[PDB]
Write an enzyme that holds these catalytic residues in place. Sequence first.
Site, PDB file in Angstrom:
ATOM      1  N   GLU A  35     114.157  15.116 -38.363  1.00  0.00           N
ATOM      2  CA  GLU A  35     114.111  14.629 -36.975  1.00  0.00           C
ATOM      3  C   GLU A  35     115.185  15.314 -36.128  1.00  0.00           C
ATOM      4  OE1 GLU A  35     111.811  13.116 -35.601  1.00  0.00           O
ATOM      5  OE2 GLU A  35     110.705  12.022 -37.210  1.00  0.00           O
ATOM      6  N   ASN A  46     108.807  14.479 -25.153  1.00  0.00           N
ATOM      7  CA  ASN A  46     107.403  14.384 -25.617  1.00  0.00           C
ATOM      8  C   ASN A  46     106.494  14.827 -24.474  1.00  0.00           C
ATOM      9  OD1 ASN A  46     108.655  11.474 -27.297  1.00  0.00           O
ATOM     10  ND2 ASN A  46     108.307  13.507 -28.190  1.00  0.00           N
ATOM     11  N   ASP A  48     104.019  13.343 -23.243  1.00  0.00           N
ATOM     12  CA  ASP A  48     103.636  12.135 -22.459  1.00  0.00           C
ATOM     13  C   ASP A  48     104.753  11.730 -21.489  1.00  0.00           C
ATOM     14  OD1 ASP A  48     105.500  10.724 -24.102  1.00  0.00           O
ATOM     15  OD2 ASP A  48     104.078   9.321 -24.858  1.00  0.00           O
ATOM     16  N   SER A  50     107.823  10.632 -22.353  1.00  0.00           N
ATOM     17  CA  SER A  50     108.854   9.866 -23.094  1.00  0.00           C
ATOM     18  C   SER A  50     109.818  10.899 -23.685  1.00  0.00           C
ATOM     19  CB  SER A  50     108.262   8.974 -24.189  1.00  0.00           C
ATOM     20  OG  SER A  50     107.620   9.755 -25.212  1.00  0.00           O
ATOM     21  N   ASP A  52     112.631  11.381 -27.220  1.00  0.00           N
ATOM     22  CA  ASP A  52     113.174  10.945 -28.542  1.00  0.00           C
ATOM     23  C   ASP A  52     114.700  11.185 -28.553  1.00  0.00           C
ATOM     24  OD1 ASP A  52     110.509  10.442 -29.238  1.00  0.00           O
ATOM     25  OD2 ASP A  52     110.365  12.034 -30.749  1.00  0.00           O
ATOM     26  N   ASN A  59     112.023   6.842 -29.790  1.00  0.00           N
ATOM     27  CA  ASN A  59     111.187   7.216 -28.623  1.00  0.00           C
ATOM     28  C   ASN A  59     111.362   6.157 -27.530  1.00  0.00           C
ATOM     29  OD1 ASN A  59     109.186   7.987 -26.878  1.00  0.00           O
ATOM     30  ND2 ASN A  59     107.620   8.360 -28.446  1.00  0.00           N
ATOM     31  N   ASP A 101     107.788  -2.718 -38.147  1.00  0.00           N
ATOM     32  CA  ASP A 101     106.736  -2.904 -37.101  1.00  0.00           C
ATOM     33  C   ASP A 101     105.339  -2.881 -37.725  1.00  0.00           C
ATOM     34  OD1 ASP A 101     106.321  -3.294 -34.119  1.00  0.00           O
ATOM     35  OD2 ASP A 101     105.141  -1.457 -34.358  1.00  0.00           O
TER      36      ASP A 101
END
Length: 129
Positions: A35, A46, A48, A50, A52, A59, A101
């Site tokens: 990562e 990202n 979209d 967003s 990280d 995110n 989650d």
Amino acid sequence: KVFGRCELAAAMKRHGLDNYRGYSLGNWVCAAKFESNFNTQATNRNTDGSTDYGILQINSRWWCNDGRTPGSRNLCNIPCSALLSSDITASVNCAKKIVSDGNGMNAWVAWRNRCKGTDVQAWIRGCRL
Ligand code: NA
């Protein structure tokens, strides 16, 4: 901060990540490697819009507030900047909520593609833990 491999293993252990939700410490070190390359200051945008943040590339879409991700949530109740600290406490606390989650460590696509099913114990090999 750029951690060493065993230094990060120790910090994750001290913050209770070792075998959290059944994921051995090498899984967490392996995910951190791919990562962020162990860099707490790692950020990546990202497609979209967003972003990280940090050692585990958490995110803004769901987990932290950065003020520039429309329609997003802040489920870890933290500014995304806290995830860039040399102290990993915020990244660990928020990673515990992510891995709880429902999809375990598959939430980290680099863990699924680069760590899952591999000899992840190699990541803590020789570390004094
Ligand atoms: Na957010």
